[PDB]
Symmetry: C6
């Protein structure tokens, strides 16, 4: 009877992850498109979804969605505080360690997805791999590893968008029109 | 007992979409009017609508209304972050890829409207079409395709404003005074 | 048991509308008085009223009060985003089309007041005339149309204040001390 | 069972008015002290109080506390948008009309207090007189009326504080330790 | 069943009062440390505590915590609006009259603590003396009274911290580990 | 039935603490990464966690998460109000007293964890040592103590993440997959 906020948070997260990984692949630069999306949709909208998981019983969704929206808000801030002259750019090795800490949080949360749907297990698996590769590629500096991570990132966003659209549509019809792997 | 937030969310979205596409048709430039409406009515007020669907059972309206207010916030942000020297203008091919992803989101969400009224299915069809044409016209650079999508947006906004005003007025009289193609 | 938010929203709307039409009539310039009131009283305070109508059963008041406060916020944003170098001043024609869109919303919402009190039907009719005249007076450029609309706006705002004070004053006494019909 | 939000809103308004009229009486200039208080205590904190009247049954308190908190926000915005290069200075005739609009709102809300406590009736009386004289003194320009209006405001503000500490202290003791109506 | 928000408001108030009075005593200048605390802990967090007293039955705490969180916000604003060129520094005597009004508010609220705990009566007594002395020392120009007010303020802050930790620790253990004076 | 907000608050606190102490250890400078995390994850997200403890019965979690979330926001404000020309950098002895005040708050709240999980007791033990050492290293000026406290801080940050992921994963599986010493 309380709506499911998981699709909103999953859409917010997934769509924004794709755009950032279109840059990481190399097709585009880290644009105001990625930044605006990280502010309002991958951040704010996902924080909303996470807070709405509270009156549902969902500690995982509360812990997950809220944490990743906060991640997108930190990321946009790291990129935009220099353009405001408050902080200097980041150190990519420090940027690498930052992305690594978010990686282990996802690693633990993966074990939390094991009784849930199978698409959900995949988005947490792929997201751990994405963060891992970016942690390596930024600490050592390999542009190649970051290009490979980018392709893993595009898949991650597509999975999360599908899972969200899976949830919303199965609820809408009453039967599982899009397979998820419950 | 809980009010219907859909007319407000539809009004905010619908009115702001008309204004933006009066520019896409070519009659006007991308003004602060579109930006102001995109901030407060197509964005915030629709975000209110999406959040107010939560205590209703409406996962769809929560997912829908909340995401499009966020989109309008991202759009104004992409256009105004350059004026602030935070970001450089954006790649239109990236803008096209951004607008296309929102089209894929609406496309799935249209399939969710299949048991709902007819106008709602129409707004989601034209809105799927709107995002598609603009994404095409922006990746390739066809001013003609963009002038055509502008006309599709004008009808689309008219549909949502009509749907919103239907719902509010059908509720008020107790009989369905405005046809919504239930 | 839940308080009535309509007087707050009507007060915010009405008072803000009077002051803005004191400029549209011509007695004063488009001041920070109008701009402040448009930010906090006709905009924010009315958005509260609209949002407080939600746990009540009131879809009309939710959609109406919330949309008009948002209008006042967009209006102030259109008038103040230039002073900040974010947006060029706006073409009046659009303003007319923008005020015209807000007019059509008000027209439909007028048909929605047909089972409510009488003063409420009047504020929504006169506001429909107000939005309509301004849309015309701005697309065409008639200063005269805008001077007349201002007087329609002063009457509209005074009506919303009167209705608001009716509801609050009728509720307090137990009889309809102010006739609202 | 829900806490009483009137003492907070009364405190926010009352304390802020006292400070502002120490300027209107003439003791001080219109300081940033008044502006800070107008932002956070007579403004935001009272808006909280107004909104907290909603789940209580109190439409009068909702409408009043919420409207005056917004009023204090509009005034600070009117005084500070010039220092920000947004709004030029305000027109004193218009400010008088603006304070006049806020004056009529208080006048009606005064008639709503007729079955309520006695001190509450006084604060709305003095606020009505306060707004009236300031509108008079501002459209007309008598510094003396405004110096006189200020002295009315110090009494108005001191009374609202007195009512607030009454409400809180009478509830706390269970008997009326501080006399109110 | 609702948490007790009083310890949060008492912590914010008390810790911020100590810091400010390390300056009033003379050890330090009115540093940004005092101002940061005044914004977020003595101001914002205490306003949270105050709003949380509403669903409890607690009008005193609602009226108290919410007003003093606002005081700390007005205090920061008085000190930071000149650095923004919005206001010219305050006059003192007006500052003294301002702190004098907060003293009269605190005085009445002291009579309200007479059925509450004994330490609670003390924080309101010493705060009344704190505001009184600072009002005098600022109207009269005595650096000496303002140094004396500083030491009373250090005690006032320490009481609130002890009281807060009594409340939290007594609830946690089930017996009164720290004496308060119920 | 209300989600457990402790993992969110614990994640926010811990992850951000690790990074700030990667600076205290000496590997990195006080980056925009540390500032971004302090704003959104160690600050906002933890205030969220703390406020959600209210409808649960948890006065301790309310007092703790909200106060620390406020701490990161004051610390970010201390580091950023100078970059804006609002305040002058802090005096390190005054910072030391400020961090010491947060230390006594943590010391008392430690006594509040004695019936809780052992890891919970550990995060409060190491956090008390962390504040005490940093308060000492800044009052006296020992860079060495601050290099050592940084190591104690890293351990502390690790615990809070471990406890957070313990809580989430134990609820999710139904058995204690990760030991927390209940
Ligand atoms: C992309 C990272 C942001 C989203 C993090 C994943 C959100 C997972 C929410 O799903 C919910 O998880 C629970 C697990 O059992 C189920 O109770 C519930 O039914 C399922 O719907
Ligand atoms: C103070 C300046 C104007 C701001 C708003 C003041 C409104 C105070 C509301 O009062 C409340 O009204 C109820 C009926 O009116 C009474 O039950 C009660 O006596 C009183 O608690
Ligand atoms: C110094 C400014 C901040 C101080 C504000 C203190 C208000 C706290 C109110 O006390 C709380 O109210 C009841 C009695 O008040 C008790 O039952 C409750 O348990 C107690 O915790």
């Amino acid at each position: 009877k309380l709506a499911n906020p998981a699709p909103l948070g999953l859409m917010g997260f997934g769509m924004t992850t794709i755009l950032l990984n279109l840059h990481n692949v190399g097709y585009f630069a880290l644009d105001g498109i990625i930044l605006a999306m990280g502010i309002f949709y991958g951040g704010i909208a996902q924080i909303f979804a996470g807070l709405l998981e509270y009156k549902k019983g969902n500690t995982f969704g509360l812990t997950a969605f809220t944490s990743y929206g906060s991640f997108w808000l930190t990321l946009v801030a790291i990129l935009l505080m220099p353009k405001l002259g408050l902080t200097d750019a980041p150190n990519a090795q420090f940027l690498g360690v930052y992305l690594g800490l978010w990686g282990v949080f996802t690693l633990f949360m993966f074990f939390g997805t094991l009784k849930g749907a199978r698409v959900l297990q995949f988005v947490f698996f792929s997201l751990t791999v994405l963060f891992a590769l970016l942690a390596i590629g930024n600490i050592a500096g390999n542009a190649a590893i970051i290009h490979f991570a980018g392709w893993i990132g595009l898949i991650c966003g597509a999975s999360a968008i599908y899972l969200a659209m899976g949830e919303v549509l199965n609820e809408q019809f009453g039967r599982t029109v899009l397979p998820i792997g419950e």
